Design a protein around this nucleic acid. Sequence first.
RNA 1: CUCGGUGUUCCCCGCGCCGCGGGG
Length: 250
Amino acid sequence: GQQHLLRFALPAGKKLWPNDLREALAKHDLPPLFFSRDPQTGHAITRAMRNEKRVRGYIEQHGHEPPPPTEEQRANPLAIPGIRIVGSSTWVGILATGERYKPLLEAATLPAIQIVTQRCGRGVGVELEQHTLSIKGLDDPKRYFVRNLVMKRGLTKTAENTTQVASRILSALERQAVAYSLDLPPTAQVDIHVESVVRPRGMRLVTSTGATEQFVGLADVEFYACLDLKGYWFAGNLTSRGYGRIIADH
RNA sequence: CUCGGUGUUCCCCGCGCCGCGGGG
Ligand SMILES: [Mn+2]
């Protein structure tokens, strides 16, 4: 429920994209869960099962019943990244969602200062924010953006992409609300409207093991909803790299 | 205190009849 954001203000002349900070932090001997890798699988965090039909299918495949969830699978059954590297053109930062992940932020803090000050030179500002994730309905529409929404599949350049993007935002807000035990208002109250899907484009998917041949869909979004979102909410894929951050217009 | 990458499969979970979802 509690979010901690270590935020660095970048000097006017300087870029340090969230992926750049993430890549540089990977050279600093941090725990795998900082990078959303489950330390008990050696692979990226993934969702948990729960079904009696899924058990049956698992038994047919493997010849035994599913093992217990790992510690991260039990704590994080919807596989939402507890650490995200976030930012925009003017700042970069580390977001911990939940007290569980705050020690990972703490371990990365001096490394992050080293990286940002070495890349940017002098003039880096620092803030440390704390927020309570909350979602509450409104009577009138509130304007939001999504910065660099990533959709691994399904983002087109044609007019129906506004509806597709709207559905992806609803799906993501429902997933976070379930994960954090928050109440979403009725959809007819929320009444999401995607006003603009800005410059729908491609982005080559790069992993820690190198650049792939997959491209993902990437766009910027303006939308309205009768919702007051407090804290940092996300939509789409690849959010541990800061994609899909929802931003209230001010 | 939103709008760097112009377009699809490298891996891990999972579902379906290659396709789709989730993680990176
Ligand atoms: Mn409407």
